[PDB]
């Protein structure tokens, strides 16, 4: 019940007591493990809301060494009063900042959590319109990008009330490339964004129909129809992709954007639901070079790179895919580093996470971690996280998935 | 109750009902996932007549179902026979056909095994009449010769007598039938395979005269009927090895690397209808990454990345040059090239994972599911350019099964 995790490369053994504080469910049972399911299933009556608020305030006042004190009891009483009256409540600025940093700290699928405490939280709870949302998002983008010296940030729009007045960013990321289905049946640009690229066109947008067209923002305030906004191109930092050895690499015409900024998740703090809460950090190189570039359901460039490398593509056992894969990921890192845009390779990031785990076990009693997501999509076993046992459990505050708004919106 | 899994690259959705026939626990709960724990409590293995007949009945029901004889007179008589044999003798014996079925289905049920497309073509050698360590040595030699087949490898398992009172166990003390020694030097470095240092020390203590090189095949340490284990040397003409060279880099051979051809796991426990076979070596053929990624490049194994990267003259100062990833690919090319050139059976990780997906889809169609452990099925390099990376997998425990068991030197009561 006081569980232990072993690193099989170093024999370091850590003891986990934090899991006992787990609140939500994993979708596993003792008869079946669902550890590789992408998304298991896992409005609030007045009954459900106050315990959730109590739990959150308890951990907040503990964190500032004021558990069971003056201010703690008062704030519990005050929030207790507000829920009885308004059937909801509002976080003080300090509690909102704490809740957001801890949602990141608790994200068991995130390898970059050693940075969790440096998050810049932009309070946008006074926003009322999509034009105002656009303004907050431009400021976020500019602040986070910082001319290539990327800084972590989250912007938090007003919380859900009755489900009718939801704030939503319809984009999955603030910055993503368009995808178009060609007449000849193929796909131009990013195939993952074909449907969204249509809900932009088939709703107003005017597509350049290129291979790397920055999508517009589709912003929904207070439950109204969403509105199209173009991010000022001067705010969208992009990196042309070249190789430090293959001069033909530059001729491939590849680029990527510097800022990874997830915008479709739900931030839950003390029972309150923030349905629009775009957050951003900086890339790990494999996210672009392995997944974005080489997935068969994405830009899928492996064949073309290997052909330009003149590798033997007759038999899989020549490992031509693996050879091209390494080079593509050398070029991504080389290009970001050359343009002075923050990026981390998978070796450095997983080493940081092991140190972060050791820190969290030593100072917090544990660190929930999802091995299936933490281990990078290339060279898995030469990174230290491959040999690290991890316990996965759900702590709150948390980031959660939510349905795509176009399947839900009372249009 | 039905359950769905999705392949996120193809959008193929499959429906699992087989998990309903699961009994053993996983280690997970509603509040914690233990999916990345190497040996959970439930995957490891002291058994009385109390719980044995229901385990036998379940196995015999499965067996007679697969042969389309469920409820037949042969089925009912066999249940009656096993029942009376249990109450009178406290255990029972499997027929040859049941043992073959059981061993094949233990492999079929091995959720961490990516090679299960081959499960129905397993050669089962019945060594239940064995009584002495020398008899074990002879059975293992025939297994190695048959399975090796001059490079054209064949899957096989040899099954020694089942456990009785746990005081007379048959055990192969080696973790694999063929493995290289490892020696800790006084300066703290290791010669050979660091994973085998502890077992190497036991062999030396038992009287093995060690050549003390980097690729010495370990002797067999064999325990019959709960007696002290005895040392045996596999005939070298039976140990097929492959010198590792690279198809473009002529300096690669000068690294002096080789590996053996036959992967043969010898420390696991085979459970069939409540019976425990503590000595059941099994063998197949290698997937290239097992050698090229894990054996050669794990920091805690031969750990050749640096010396390989040096000879390639990559930028080794910063990790963002991916010199480690670049060396890793070339080493894995060398392993596959060497085995194929010597006509020793091997499969690369692209082929093996593709076969597994086809196997898994077929198992969902004809069996209602396929228990699979993503953490183990995804290869240790180039994960997401294989199709299993994108495959949702349900992991649950079916019997018959292979289980872990403690190392015998930790439990054995020495005779002297
Ligand atoms: C600063 C550098 C960061 C790095 C290098 C990083 C890296 C990653 C990576 C590689 C993933 C895997 C997901 C995928 O492959 O698509 C991930 C997941 C995630 N990240 Fe981080 N991240 C960073 C910052 C942040 C920040 C600032 C937040 C929120 C404040 C965050 C929250 C999350 C969440 C919630 C997930 C998983 C979503 C899920 O549960 O499916 N990350 N991260
Ligand atoms: C025929 C070619 C085969 C291939 C390519 C293959 C491949 C693999 C691989 C790569 C693993 C992962 C384990 C590791 O990385 O150390 C594995 C696990 C396993 N294999 Fe197979 N295997 C084959 C045949 C067999 C046979 C014949 C059996 C038994 C009759 C078997 C039973 C198992 C079991 C029980 C495990 C799980 C070990 C555990 O639970 O920790 N395999 N296999
Ligand atoms: C801030 C940040 C930094 C970084 N380096 N990478 C990312 C992308 C990670 C990410 C991806 C997804 C898509 C899930 N996929 C199955 C479609 C959802 C998320 F919530 C998430 F955080 C974000
Ligand atoms: C027949 C066969 C074919 C193949 N290609 N590879 C293998 C080795 C895989 C393997 C490794 C282990 C050690 C686990 N670790 C804790 C050291 C245990 C096993 F039961 C197992 F099957 C076997
Ligand atoms: C099916 C499987 O769960 C799916 O492919 C997961 C596997 N691991 C992952 N890991 C990361 N970091 N990102 C992903 O999108 C995925 N996808
Ligand atoms: C901690 C983790 O469970 C452990 O390192 C596992 C990960 N996946 C693996 N997968 C395979 N095939 N073989 C292994 O030894 C491991 N080791
Ligand atoms: Zn689980």
Asked whether the beta carbons of B245 and B379 are under 8 A apart, the reply is no
The two beta strands, A217-220 and A168-169, are antiparallel
Chain A neighbors of B385, CB-CB under 8 A:
290, 294, 302, 321-322, 325, 378
Q: Which residue from B78, B62, B230 is spatially nearest to B140, judged by alpha carbons?
A: B230
Return d(Cα A260, Cα A152) in angstroms, integer.
10
Q: Dihedral angle at the C-alpha atoms of B186, B187, B188, B190, nearest 10 degrees?
A: -80
Q: Which residue from A325, A318, A321 is spatially nearest to A346, judged by alpha carbons?
A: A325
A116, A205, A282, A320: the active-site residue = A282
Coil, strand or helix: which one is A383? coil
Provide the residue count of chain A. Answer: 411
Sign of the C-alpha dihedral computed for residues B192, B196, B202 and B206 taken in this order: negative
Return d(Cα B103, Cα A356) in angstroms, integer.
44
Pocket residue to mutate for ligand 3, from A100, A260, A286, A346, most atoms within 8 A of Cβ: A260
CA distances from A224 to A89, A195, A409 (A): 23, 21, 9
Return d(Cα B35, Cα B49) in angstroms, integer.
33
- Residues with Cβ within 8 Å of B410's Cβ and at least 6 positions away in sequence, in order, are none
Q: In what order do the strands lie in the sheet with B269-272?
A: B275-277, B269-272, B401-403
Best of A10, A17, A23, A32 to mutate (most B CBs within 10 Å, chain B)? A32
CA B382 to the chain's CA centroid: 22
Question: DSSP readout, A244-256?
Answer: SS-HHHHHT--EE
Pocket residue to mutate for ligand 4, from B116, B158, B263, B285, most atoms within 8 A of Cβ: B263
B367 among known catalytic residues: no
DSSP state of B399: S
Q: Which residue from A341, A293, A302 is spatially nearest to A149, judged by alpha carbons?
A: A341
- Residues with Cβ within 8 Å of A349's Cβ and at least 6 positions away in sequence, in order, are A111, A112, A284, A376
* Cβ atoms within 10 Å of A206's Cβ, excluding its own: 10
Asked whether the beta carbons of A383 and A347 are under 8 A apart, the reply is yes
B319: closest chain A residue by CA: A347
Provide the residue count of chain B. Answer: 416
Return d(Cα A111, Cα A388) in angstroms, integer.
13
Coil, strand or helix: which one is B221? strand
Q: Does B314 touch chain A (CB under 8 A)?
A: no
Beta bridge partners of A154: A121, A279
Is residue B103 within a helix (H) or strand (E), and if so which, with residue range? helix B96-108
Is cis: bond before B92, omega within 30 of 0?
A: no
Q: Rg for chain B (alpha carbons), in Å? A: 23
CA A250 to the chain's CA centroid: 29
Reported structure resolution in angstroms: 1.9
* B19, B30, B340 member nearest A25 (Cβ): B30
Interface of B with A in 36-75 (CB under 8 A): 36-38
A110 among known catalytic residues: yes
B109 CB-side CA count, 13 A: 24
Return d(Cα B8, Cα B227) in angstroms, integer.
53
Rounded to a whole number, what is the largest CA-CA distance in chain A?
74
Asked whether the beta carbons of B157 and B125 are under 8 A apart, the reply is yes
Q: Does A345 touch chain B (CB under 8 A)?
A: yes
Q: Does B308 touch chain A (CB under 8 A)?
A: no
Binding residues of B for L-arginine: 176, 285-286, 290
Min Cα–Cα distance to chain A from B53, Å:
22
Coil, strand or helix: which one is B365? helix
B98, B113, B323, B370: the active-site residue = B113
A113 among known catalytic residues: yes
Q: Whose CA is nearest to atom 13 of ligand 6?
A: B376
CA distances from A108 to A399, B97, B123 (A): 10, 48, 44
Domains plus CATH for chain A? 16-125+152-162+266-280+350-374 (3.90.340.10), 126-151+166-237+401-405 (3.90.440.10), 238-260+283-348 (3.90.1230.10)
Return d(Cα B62, Cα B41) in angstroms, integer.
26
B113 among known catalytic residues: yes
Give the ligand with the smallest distance to the CA of B117: 2
Residue A154 alpha carbon, nearest atom of ligand 1: 30
Asked whether the beta carbons of A361 and A302 are under 8 A apart, the reply is no
A274 CB-side CA count, 13 A: 28
Binning chain B into helix, strand and coil, the percentages to the nearest 5 are 40, 15, 45
B290, B294, B301, B354: the active-site residue = B290
B382 and A386: CB-CB below 8 Å?
no
Return d(Cα A382, Cα A386) in angstroms, integer.
7
Asked whether the beta carbons of B390 and B18 are under 8 A apart, the reply is no
Q: Take residue B345 and report the two structure tokens written for it.
A: 């059976």
Measured in Å, how far apart are chain A's first and last C-alpha atoms? 49
Asked whether the beta carbons of B239 and B260 are under 8 A apart, the reply is yes
Q: Does A290 touch chain B (CB under 8 A)?
A: yes
B351: closest chain A residue by CA: A316
Q: Which residue from B77, B45, B43 is spatially nearest to B60, judged by alpha carbons?
A: B77
What is the Å distance from ligand 2's center to B115 Cα?
Answer: 6
Long-range contacts from B405-410, C-beta under 8 angstroms, 24+ separation: B405/B44, B405/B45, B405/B267, B405/B268, B405/B269, B405/B278, B406/B44, B407/B173, B407/B267, B408/B169, B408/B171, B408/B173, B408/B223, B408/B229, B409/B173, B409/B202
Chain B neighbors of A27, CB-CB under 8 A:
30
Q: Which residue from B276, B240, B264, B281 is spatially nearest to B136, judged by alpha carbons?
A: B281
Q: Does B333 touch chain A (CB under 8 A)?
A: yes
A29 and B28: CB-CB below 8 Å?
yes
A333 and B322: CB-CB below 8 Å?
yes
Residue A390 alpha carbon, nearest atom of ligand 6: 1
Pocket residue to mutate for ligand 2, from B113, B285, B295, B351, most atoms within 8 A of Cβ: B113
A95, A105, A110, A127: the active-site residue = A110
Q: Does B11 touch chain A (CB under 8 A)?
A: no
Best of A317, A344, A353 to mutate (most B CBs within 10 Å, chain B)? A317
With 0-12 CB in 10 A as exposed, 13-18 as middle and 19+ as buried, what is A181?
middle
Return d(Cα B70, Cα B400) in angstroms, integer.
18
Method in brief: X-ray
Binding residues of A: 36, 110, 173, 282-283, 287, 372-373, 386, 401
CA distances from A197 to A141, A213, B214, B227, B402 (A): 21, 10, 59, 72, 50
């Amino acid at each position: 019940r006081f569980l232990k995790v072993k690193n099989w490369e170093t024999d370091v053994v850590l003891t986990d007591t934090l899991h006992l504080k787990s609140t939500l469910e994993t979708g596993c049972t003792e008869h079946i493990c669902m550890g590789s399911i992408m998304l298991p299933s896992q409005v609030r009556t007045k009954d459900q809301l106050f315990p959730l608020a109590k739990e959150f305030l308890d951990q907040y006042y503990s964190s500032i060494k004021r558990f069971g004190s003056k201010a703690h009891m008062d704030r519990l009483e005050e929030v207790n009063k507000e829920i009885e009256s308004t059937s909801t409540y509002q976080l003080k600025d300090t509690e909102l900042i704490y809740g957001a940093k801890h949602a990141w700290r608790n994200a068991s699928r995130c390898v970059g959590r050693i940075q969790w405490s440096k998050l810049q939280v932009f309070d946008a709870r006074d926003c009322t319109t999509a034009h105002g949302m656009f303004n907050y998002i431009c400021n976020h983008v500019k602040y986070a990008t910082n001319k290539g010296n990327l800084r972590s940030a989250i912007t938090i729009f007003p919380q859900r009330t009755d489900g009718k007045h939801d704030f939503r960013v319809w984009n999955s990321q603030l910055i993503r490339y368009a995808g178009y289905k060609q007449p000849d049946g193929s796909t131009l640009g990013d195939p993952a964004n074909v449907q969204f690229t249509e809900i932009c066109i088939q709703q107003g947008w005017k597509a350049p129909r290129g291979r790397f067209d920055v999508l517009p923002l589709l912003l929904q305030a207070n439950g109204n129809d969403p509105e199209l906004f173009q991010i000022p191109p001067e705010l969208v930092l992009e990196v042309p992709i070249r190789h430090p050895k293959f001069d033909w690499f530059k001729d491939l015409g590849l680029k990527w954007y510097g800022l990874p900024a997830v915008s479709n998740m739900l931030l839950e703090i003390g029972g309150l639901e923030f349905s629009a809460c775009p957050f951003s950090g900086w890339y790990m190189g494999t996210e672009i070079g392995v997944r974005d570039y080489c997935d068969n359901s994405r830009y899928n460039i492996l064949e073309e790179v290997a052909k330009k490398m003149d590798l033997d593509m007759r038999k899989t056992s020549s490992l031509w895919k693996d050879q091209a894969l390494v080079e593509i990921n050398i070029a991504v890192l080389y290009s970001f580093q050359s343009d002075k845009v923050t990026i981390v390779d998978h070796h450095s990031a997983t080493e940081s996470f092991i140190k972060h785990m050791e820190n969290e076990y030593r100072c917090r009693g544990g660190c929930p971690a999802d091995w299936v997501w933490i281990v990078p999509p290339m060279s898995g076993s030469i990174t230290p996280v491959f040999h690290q046992e991890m316990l996965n459990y759900r702590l709150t505050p948390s980031f959660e998935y939510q349905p795509d708004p176009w399947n839900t919106h009372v249009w």
